[PDB]
Amino acid sequence: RHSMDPPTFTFNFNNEPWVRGRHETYLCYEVERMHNDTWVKLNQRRGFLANQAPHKHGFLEGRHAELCFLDVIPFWKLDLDQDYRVTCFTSWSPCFSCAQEMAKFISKNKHVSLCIKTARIYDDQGRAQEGLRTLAEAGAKISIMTYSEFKHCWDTFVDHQGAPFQPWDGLDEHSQDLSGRLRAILQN
Ligand SMILES: [Cl-]
Ligand SMILES: [Mg+2]
Ligand SMILES: [Zn+2]
Ligand SMILES: [Zn+2]
């Protein structure tokens, strides 16, 4: 097991709008359990993953990070009588069908409260916004990553070799613009 490579982190979680080539989606997750009215981190549950490449046979897209995330949750063997808060830090927001699947998951697993904190919004000008609205309606808390979340991911998920988090240019500007955009999506 290895932590995330720093250049991988930086390349993927960079929130600058005017670059291209971030085809992947990285997803960092943490789990908390409610213990006497206090959320308590379960640190064995921490991890990260990314979207998969398509199989050489063709026709099918590579499995999206969000589905793989949903794939592993049952193996956590969470106690259905207990309460958990599951937080994902994602480089991109979910596509519509991933949002739909995530909405179905949280619908059927009331022991989980899902929080999605995303570096960037992927809006395909199609159903993406519907998906975010639908996921929020099902009870997911969707928000935009700020300095605080980026630093946390760096400290927690990245192989940093003691180096502190160094914000890239415009991190706060972009984050503020995205928060506004997300507010407009979720009230729209
Ligand atoms: Cl991109
Ligand atoms: Mg900029
Ligand atoms: Zn296959
Ligand atoms: Zn997807």
Is 16 marked active-site? no
Give the structural domain span for 113: 1-188
- Report whether 28 contacts 157 (CB < 8 A): yes
Residue 53 tokens read as 């490449």
Annotated catalytic residue within 16, 24, 32, 66: 66
* Alpha-carbon distance values, 50 to 9, 57, 66, 107, 124 (Å): 11, 21, 8, 24, 20
Rounded to whole angstroms, the Cα distance separating 126 from 157 reads 32
Entry resolution (Å): 2.2
Spatial separation of the C-alpha atoms in residues 112 and 149, rounded to whole Å? 21
Around ion ligand 1, residues with a beta carbon closer than 5 Å are: 20, 22
Q: What angle do CA 57, 58, 64 make, to 5 degrees?
A: 110
Residues in the chain: 188
Solving technique: X-ray
Q: Could you give the number of structural domains in the chain?
A: 1
